[PDB]
Ligand SMILES: CC(/C=C/C(=O)NO)=C\[C@@H](C)C(=O)c1ccc(N(C)C)cc1
Ligand SMILES: [K+]
């Protein structure tokens with residue numbers, strides 16, 4: 337019957353202010369005091385080895401004992417990555433903050449939780465850094481829920497404006513972890529420019545049907561488009577999947593005002609989206625911060641999400657409840673690509 341909040345994240349360009357402005361607005365709007373302040377912890381190597389290779393962990397650990405030239409040389413071998421001697425330490429705390437909430441949520445000590453962590457996670461891969469992530473916070477937390485808390489089925493929902501290809505790759509053959517991502521795509525012209533971000537990538541082998549990509553091919557999508565996408569695609573699959581834990585890649589670079597997302601989703605929308613997800617998995621729901629590059633837009637998105645976690649009434653949506661035709665095409669094609677796998681889509 338509480339909502340947990342973890343904040344250790346600053347001591348690490350598109351900014352430590354990302355996370356300190358969130359806390360400030362959480363405090364100002366009275367939401368911080370209404371949360372159960374949960375302490376972060378450092379991830380162990382064994383928890384990291386759930387998802388990442390041994391050679392990658394060793395390489396990432398040696399990142400602190402490197403010179404400024406050693407860091408820049410390594411960083412260029414990755415796509416969109418900046419290294420600094422404190423990255424590894426902060427990334428270990430970033431993972432561990434999610435693991436702290438998963439513990440509290442699975443043991444019924446709290447109803448739900450939100451980690452306000454940096455660095456983000458959803459681009460990080462088995463053996464490489466990518467898009468500012470070193471370790472995949474949510475991928476680790478999902479396998480940790482299975483191993484330590486005996487979860488059979490984890491649902492990961494990724495509403496950051498970018499595709500979390502790292503989460504997709506890690507669980508691509510895995511029917512026990514269902515990954516849903518809605519993201520700006522524009523037929524590959526938007527980063528990370530991947531064919532496998534399209535709705536045709538539905539998983540492979542026994543994982544088929546358990547990877548769901550919803551790619552936006554126009555800019556300026558709004559709350560009605562996300563609500564329609566949740567109500568007609570994600571939630572029917574979720575109730576059929578019957579997860580025992582929901583993890584959210586909670587980026588807010590789709591919020592109105594984000595300098596690089598190019599979407600017009602009102603922050604209030606994330607109250608609704610969060611509320612919908614509470615109906616699944618007996619409300620066992622953990623959000624973890626990903627992207628967000630307008631300090632104020634990001635802080636409002638967090639606050640709207642936190643209000644639903646706390647059980648406050650849903651807000652008024654300023655935007656139309658109607659989805660645009662471009663969104664309906666994207667939604668239609670993903671449903672079609674996943675039709676043979678989910679009875680609930682076959683209306
Ligand atoms: C990775 C990312 C967002 C991730 C996110 O938010 N995932 O959720 C944005 C990239 C495209 C970007 O904008 C960028 C800017 C500068 C740069 N260098 C100066 C090297 C490299 C990349
Ligand atoms: K996404």
Ligand SMILES: [K+]
Nearest residue numbers: 507510513546
């Ligand atoms: K999967």
Ligand SMILES: [Zn+2]
Nearest residue numbers: 496497498627
């Ligand atoms: Zn993003």
